[PDB]
Amino acid sequence: KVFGRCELAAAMKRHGLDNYRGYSLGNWVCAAKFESNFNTQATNRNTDGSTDYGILQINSRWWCNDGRTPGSRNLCNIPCSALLSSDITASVNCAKKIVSDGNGMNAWVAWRNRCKGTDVQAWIRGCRL
Ligand SMILES: [Cl-]
DSSP states (O other): OBOOHHHHHHHHHHTTOTTBTTBOHHHHHHHHHHHHTTBTTOEEEOTTSOEEETTTTEETTTTOBOSOOTTOOOTTOSBGGGGGSSSTHHHHHHHHHHHTSSSGGGGSHHIIIIITTSOGGGGGTTOOO
């Protein structure tokens, strides 16, 4: 599923990510924009041999099982394909786990390099929430 900006903001808000661990909704929308262009089916292989899945490009090294990442930890206890569904519930609940980990949203390199420190509220501009 390719989400619209305000559509995704609406879904993330309903799943409790606005101000989750102190991160405002626009931080989450901005991250999804640059990780996946709001496409739940996005996948990208990492140099270490792991793969990133879904709207927030959650990796198979620590977080989900994709059966081809040696050393995998599957901390969200899910197959990585669940992260690709049109229903973003699995992605959001896993992200909740990641952002609580210790390094916050710095866990997502695109957030750190492209959203962090910027006017992230713009990402929810115009949206009815
Ligand atoms: Cl846009």
